[PDB]
């Protein structure tokens, strides 16, 4: 696939192909360069280029593995913020789907695993490197992601209201009030807690939630 | 792979996240203590630099080879 | 200073990656420096690895080729000698059993019959431990409480070609199980536990039964919430009289409560699509039965390849747990397109269970030619209410033209509610309208038209008949399968029917009954026996006759493999009639205008108003597929039979022709079928031969279906 | 599918010597493909043989025709017999012929009748040949247990234990007796000595040398019969060293880097052995320095050698008998005594030479 | 109107006539938790109170709910007991 050559020619070819937008061939060249010469100067730049190419080529698992390698090999490096941002962005991009995106399906109530991972990674980025140029986009993504995780919680609470499971509803809304206090889903889920408290004849406890609802109404 | 205008740099995945509504805190009425402060899903207040959405440069930084 | 490349040659039974893994354990890999003095060390290291395979005579050579820039290329050559062979397995000290039958259960083999591959005369130290355990279980569950293995030896021939295995044992003596003393902190439930531990006086000791008694006590406690109990048996053997008394300690822990039940891997399936199948729910005392029932229901759903459960304990809480279900999404639905034989001609169709993860079941198909047009829609909501009441509908528009024309369109609605964990009922309403014009006369159809009051001429093709019907649809279903795509145990039953309510032009009633029963043989459920049948019956109410366009057909790839689709059953009988439309060449000789004075037999299938089909099918693993994806392919040998008869055919008048009212004319076939779950949905290939066949039936041995 | 690597070719040579065959008496089924030590035994003017089954026969040494026959098989069904798995070498003494078994049994049949004088059980497979000298019978079993039996009763008198490694060669070294002491070799590579009266140890020593990192790399056991002359004991191991040890102390005199499972001969100042590579060499008793080496029968799987009319005799898996002469180390002649081959040592005494084939037939060669 | 199938919906903390009698005023939170177990439901809006609710909805038969609420002071000492039988 790749002819044997000194590292400089291989890296030149890889850069030329990245600039032309040929992700697959650039990935092949960079992987060959990395395997053949893991000790040379190019050991870092090829890692970064591989991360970028993997992410653009939609080979997200490989991008995640490469980021994991890089974070362990050079836990202190001037461009770590870039790698942390790319980890968060990879986890975010691993969430969306195309078809039900086109048909306008609300994907909030599907698996939130990747959303939580991306939130963790972006939070690490923003708390660690507030001066980096990626902090603003990280904050916007976090503000959206917190409300993509409160919506899932509300979606579970709605079902356990339908099936008439009241303790589950109360606990779920309590968890929402403790974790995602300021989101809109917490304001929508609050009247579900009052109904649950009143279905179990604990009215003296439902009045407190009624007070909270009244004090924050539009 | 593809042929599009400036698809080398910009993010993949549109810009839906820029339309998310801002967050606002709940008010605790008189004579009660809300539990809200107990979470770890905190978003720090930061005035950090940066662009947003498609205006960001994802191209990897250039090591001083 | 560096190895530029590494190559392996001669290895046959060992994947090169395994050798590389062994090589890197010695500190050699691409990019590492190499020392020529250590070449022998690498060779010896690789040599020692093959002892795991039993090829004790193997040898390995390492070749180093210089490369520019002081790089080197390393090439490894392997001489994989023949593996050692088990010459004998000897058991010394056994007096109660024949050494032949003790070995018969061993995983290892000293002899392999020619007529079947019961195993291989190869040696693997991993299997020896399991074989020793099997021997212990065989000896220890026959009452030999004192059985123990003194020592074992594995030996090697001086030519390194043969293996000898010896096992020393001490039998002791048989013992009687005098009684069981279950005691401890039972937390009540003494009634159930005392019954689980029932023994008969003089019953022989049995270790496997003791293990089963412990597992059953664990399961009983786990049913009430104590899902972390402590159960321990401590037999007290008495060699003085050779009685053994089985003391069992039971200590139920704390009743556990479910804090959360979480689903993982449902990347596309909506969350509530999984929760509405659960029987264990948050904030309630735990029950293992319900947690397993949730798995069973999710499996029966059919949307997921694999469903797994977990009950991780909550850290820092003595009496709470979380329940995690990990699912692997399956590519539900089907697609199938095509083009006509011979201008524009094309067919289409899409079916989707779990449409976009919403749980709906949607299906669309149609076709457009010069001859005909056809279209259909179907939408079903499995949970129209929380309990499981479903609501669905259907539309279709059919327009066929030769001349002989048939326009038909209708509607349908059905509301089905459960009656039990496995049973279900249904009800609905339907509407159908049929416009028939210029049908060429024939007995089977003119009889029906006469029953309806129509009196068309028998010698012309210019008569028309139009009708309109309202029906009441009912049904019932029993479902206890293991899975929804490739089941391996359990049965299914599905009764369906309909009847015309007053005011419909034609009066009749119709019934069908599909069945399926899987009986596993192997413990892993790889070898399964499938029993399958279909039935049907219909007739007119009052003086009305059942319409010919609702008849039963059989023959395709769905009912009895081997025969051309819808070719079984009665064949039409044409009256001598004029060519009112046209008389084409090389066609239309059946009772045509020219000649053909009397009634003419034919081979045009018309179906009948009663059916009976059956099938016996044997399922085996696919010979050349790894277990990694052996659950997307199934191979099968089958024996199918079916018949169709017209209960109203009158042989007294049409005596010169076959008696279609005779059920005895059974068809049959046999062959082999292969089934693969392609991205386009299931694909079925089958080769069969109709070794029982009657005049007029059309054979089709190779059949491919979506 | 893949074949063996090495096998030298039958070396052409003229038959300057004039040997011939005889007998070809079929004892029975034979050992077949199994590895065992069922060599014949000769005493007076009669021979005895076994058949890897209950079959035992005593043949006249002048004609090869039987004088009495016996079967030691045991019933296990209406028309079925459980094989005796007879695998011990035949040895003889006054009125008794002693045999071993892999069924843990040991037999002692009357010389004149073949009727069982006595029969007893031992500590596992009695693979080694029984040996008797001025006292009790001695047997070496697969469990590493060395047991002594009363020659007239079969009752165990005393037992000695030796270590057993994970993987070892299929076989057990016969004991050798000298001055009331018995010297044997174990599967661990040690050479041990004991007293006959109660099995008390006298000395122990190591001769194995591989010390590998894995079982077969460590596969080094003293499977040969140790030999004693003039107060010195020689020992050999599969991958170890040919050595000479002082009988009184067990300290080693000299080593030689040779390893094989076949026993070796001793005569004068000359010792002859067969290597694990099937090479034939002669060495000095002084220090083992080589006299001459014959190295053309590579990987033919020869049998143990014997000394007959000054000429070494050996078999192979192809049924040939090779005659070697001390005058030059050259081959004097060759025959094809049997079709199936030989996997059992030949025997010779009183000018008579004989050997048992792998198929059960017994041949006499002169 | 008519309805024909619904599962058994068990919710809450499993109380019994034995354990409910063990608890008495003056017990610390540790002892109450040991006796009755960890409560599935507590008061979040600033107050020490444990709700032991025992719901059972056996199909179409009906519904039963024992409600046992315990109020502790700031130091975790049980000051008041109030158990309310079925609805």
Author numbering:
A (entry chain D): 26 to 243
B (entry chain C): 25 to 89
C (entry chain A): 92 to 433, 437 to 496, 503 to 806
D (entry chain B): 26 to 391
E (entry chain E): 24 to 110
Extract from the study:
The β‐barrel assembly machinery (BAM complex) is essential for outer membrane protein (OMP) folding in Gram‐negative bacteria, and represents a promising antimicrobial target. BAM is thought to exist in two major conformations, defined by closing (lateral‐closed) or opening (lateral‐open) of a membrane‐facing gate in the core component BamA, itself an OMP. Transitioning between lateral open and closed states is proposed to be essential for BAM function, with multiple antimicrobials shown to bias the conformational equilibrium in vitro. In X‐ray and cryoEM structures, opening of BAM's lateral‐gate leads to an outward swinging motion of the six N‐terminal β‐strands of the barrel relative to the ten C‐terminal strands and their connecting loops.
As no structure of DAR‐B bound to the complete BAM complex has been reported, we also solved cryoEM structures of wild‐type BAM (BAM‐WT) in n‐dodecyl‐β‐D‐maltoside (DDM) micelles in the presence or absence of DAR‐B, reaching resolutions of 3.3 Å (+DAR‐B) and 3.5 Å (−DAR‐B). In the absence of DAR‐B, our new apo‐BAM‐WT structure, which is currently the highest resolution structure of this complex, is in the lateral‐open conformation, consistent with previous cryoEM structures in detergent and nanodiscs. By contrast with the lateral closed state of BAM/BamA in which eL3, which contains L501, is highly resolved and tucked towards the barrel in all structures (named here “eL3‐in”), eL3 is dynamically disordered in BAM lateral open states, adopting different conformations in different structures (“eL‐in” and “eL‐out”). In some structures, including the structure of BAM solved here, eL3 is not visible in the electron density. This is consistent with a conformational malleability of eL3, which has been shown previously using molecular dynamics simulations, where a disulphide lock designed to trap the eL3‐out conformation also enabled eL3‐in conformations. The PELDOR distance distribution obtained for the apo‐BAM in the OM is more consistent with a lateral‐open‐eL3‐in conformation (although given some persistent longer distances involved, we cannot discount the presence of a population of eL3‐out conformations). Instead, the shorter PELDOR distance distribution components observed, match well with lateral open‐eL3‐in conformations, such as that seen in BAM‐LL (a conformationally constrained BAM which contains a disulphide bond between BamA E435C S665C), and BAM stalled in the act of folding BamA. While the L501R1‐S755R1 distance distribution of apo‐BAM suggests populations of both the lateral‐closed and lateral‐open (“eL3‐in”) species in the OM, it is also broader than the in silico predicted distribution for these states. Hence, the conformational heterogeneity of BAM in cells may not be entirely represented by existing atomic models (although more distance measurements with other spin pairs will be needed to confirm this).
